[PDB]
């Protein structure tokens, strides 16, 4: 059997897999991190105005 061809197919499959990953799975994580940042920023600023 052509082992080099089996690695060929593995690489094709992995390229399609990383496509699916970086176009469905990652945006959720980045948006969650950004939501957390917005939350903490707004909390600290609203708490700042309370002092004045």
């Amino acid at each position: 059997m052509n082992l080099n061809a089996t690695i060929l197919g593995q690489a094709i499959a992995f390229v399609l897999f990383v496509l699916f990953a970086m176009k469905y799975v990652w945006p959720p994580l980045m948006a969650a991190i950004e939501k957390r940042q917005k939350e903490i920023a707004d909390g600290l600023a609203s708490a700042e105005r309370a002092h004045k």
Binding site: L8, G9, Q10, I12, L16, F17, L29, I33, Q37
Partner: protein
């Protein structure tokens, strides 16, 4: 290359091992029978991933801004709050071990399992055609030894907490009275409450093993038994699905541990 796929897969299912007694590497047809023959490749990646975990988390422990957190700090504190919420939902005692234990289990098992998503032949290609060593399979959690080590550790911890928090006078009480509560029945309960307590950790290990081991085997098969131009159409629908496994199989391993410890002490 004279690989009949039936033998190619067999090679793929072999670990790389070492003789504790003789300091020698294992063979494709030859295994030192004595149990003292460490599985080496998983230890390297295992300890490697635990190192990477502790490194990545200390490198933010010593940068933690209490103001607006950096984008990198946010994710680590996110996972920290995730674990803390689960713990303080299921546990209520004053023990300081539970939370870091849970975080270690969660992230360590997650990174261990995540390995399988990598193409199956790549690192085995390197570790033979560069280092010359005979075999390599990389997923640490895909071996009974490591999951049973974790499971028996958790079992020792369960026993520790059950002794410490209600004493032998109560520990023997739970082990003899429940369920039927009369002394004439103590001999029967002593069986059940034993095997039950034994199944709790053992299944905990095997649950993690069986999922990952077969989860690796599929990829092996997909490599060994289909022509290149087709492999993807059966690799991809599995790989994405495995993302759903590696996460849950980590999460469950965390939660049940808490559920046991909180259940043991309280």
């Amino acid at each position: 290359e004279n690989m009949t796929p039936q033998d190619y897969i067999g090679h793929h299912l072999n670990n790389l091992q070492l003789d504790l007694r003789t300091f020698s590497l294992v063979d494709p047809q030859n295994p030192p029978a004595t149990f003292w023959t460490i599985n080496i490749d998983s230890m390297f990646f295992s300890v490697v991933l635990g190192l990477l975990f502790l490194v990545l988390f200390r490198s933010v422990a010593k940068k933690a801004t209490s103001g607006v957190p950096g984008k990198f700090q946010t994710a680590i504190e996110l996972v920290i709050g995730f674990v803390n919420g689960s713990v303080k939902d299921m546990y209520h005692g004053k023990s300081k071990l539970i939370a870091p234990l849970a975080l270690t289990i969660f992230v360590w098992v997650f990174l261990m399992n995540l390995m399988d998503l990598l193409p199956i032949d790549l690192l085995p290609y390197i570790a033979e055609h560069v280092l010359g060593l005979p075999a390599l399979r990389v997923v640490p959690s895909a071996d009974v030894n490591v999951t049973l080590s974790m499971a028996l550790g958790v079992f020792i911890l369960i026993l520790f907490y059950s002794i410490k928090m209600k004493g032998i006078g109560g520990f023997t009480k739970e082990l003899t009275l429940q369920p039927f509560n009369h002394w004439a029945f103590i001999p029967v309960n002593l069986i059940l409450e034993g095997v039950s307590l034994l199944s709790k950790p053992v299944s905990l290990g095997l649950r993690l093993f069986g999922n990952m081991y077969a989860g690796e085997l599929i990829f092996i098969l997909i490599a060994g038994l289909l022509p290149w131009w087709s492999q993807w159409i059966l690799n991809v629908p599995w790989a994405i699905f495995h993302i759903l496994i590696i996460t849950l199989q980590a999460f469950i391993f965390m939660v049940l541990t808490i559920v046991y410890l909180s259940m043991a002490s309280e």
